[PDB]
Design a protein around this ligand. Structure first.
Ligand SMILES: [Ca+2]
Ligand SMILES: [Ca+2]
Length: 296
């Protein structure tokens, strides 16, 4: 029985939302993460053809392991996941692209798991108003949803810092938000811990105070979809778990679009997360089968 080599990068959001009152989220993430590792590396170091790498992220990404068959090392890093402020989903994906760049596996998969909106992203170089876009007219688009939400709850969505007298302009239906189809050349990747801020803070929308009416906002959910697209263009399959998103359309739809397609997007709760990782492992393992060697 022949299988092609496969390399998997796990990218796990460890934002503050995973802990505190919500600690069931972290605990199930840790249980299911280890379950997935064991399922994919059943022989440990002797598992032919399979390797797993691990990224966690909060306001910055963390390389927890390069590609490895070392079940114990991976499981120890998963058990050490820690809720920390910030959701730099673009950064997690960017570090996954860095790691996958060295792969010569035939099959190349990224698993992204996040329980919230992205609120951090990398700076845009030589930024102009053309790097932003307005309402699409598709009410399910992350663009239209974030604009509508920020109209309903301006200080929840838009970067603002009450400890200073500085103040953003808040959006209307005419406002423009970060695109999700910028070229890779547009992002400053010189520092994977960097984030765009206004008045010292980030957010679901980050005000670009240099630009005029109708007002312009970086949109980290769109930046994350943009980064996912670079990975898919490189040939990597993305499976995304929208984790405990509680029927919040912006969070659901923003994460759905990072996946290879809608069939690679899973809506999970802590209670049923293991079933999503089981299905992803099954899909990966079905995909690598190349039959038997029976030349004669
Ligand atoms: Ca979160
Ligand atoms: Ca302020």
């Amino acid at each position: 029985a022949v299988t092609v080599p496969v390399d998997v990068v796990m990218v796990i959001d460890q934002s503050s939302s995973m802990g505190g009152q919500n600690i069931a989220r972290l605990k199930s993430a840790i249980a299911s993460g280890q379950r997935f590792v064991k399922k994919m590396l059943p022989k440990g170091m002797a598992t032919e053809g399979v390797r797993i790498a691990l990224v966690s992220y909060d306001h910055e990404p963390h390389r927890l392991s390069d590609f490895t068959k070392d079940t114990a090392f991976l499981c120890q890093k998963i058990r050490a996941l820690t809720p920390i402020w910030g959701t730099h989903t673009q950064g997690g994906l960017k570090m996954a692209r860095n790691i996958m760049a060295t792969s010569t596996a035939v099959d190349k998969h990224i698993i992204l798991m996040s329980d919230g909106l992205a609120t951090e992203q990398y700076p845009v170089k030589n930024v102009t108003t053309a790097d932003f876009i307005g309402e699409t007219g598709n009410a399910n688009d992350p663009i239209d949803l974030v604009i509508q939400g920020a109209i309903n709850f301006p200080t929840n969505y838009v970067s603002n810092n009450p400890s200073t007298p500085l103040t953003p302009n808040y959006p209307t239906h005419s406002s423009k938000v970060g695109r999700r189809n910028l070229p890779e050349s547009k992002f400053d990747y010189s520092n994977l811990s960097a984030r765009i801020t206004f008045d010292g803070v980030a957010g679901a929308l980050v005000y670009e105070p240099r630009f005029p009416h109708p007002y312009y906002y970086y949109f980290p959910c769109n930046a994350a979809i943009n980064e996912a697209q670079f990975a898919k263009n490189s040939g990597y399959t993305i499976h995304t778990i929208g984790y405990d998103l509680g029927d919040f359309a912006l969070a659901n739809n923003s994460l759905k679009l990072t996946a290879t397609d809608e069939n690679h997007f899973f809506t999970a709760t802590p209670a049923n997360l293991a079933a999503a990782f089981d299905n992803i492992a099954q899909t990966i393992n079905i995909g690598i089968q190349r039959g038997e060697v029976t030349d004669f």
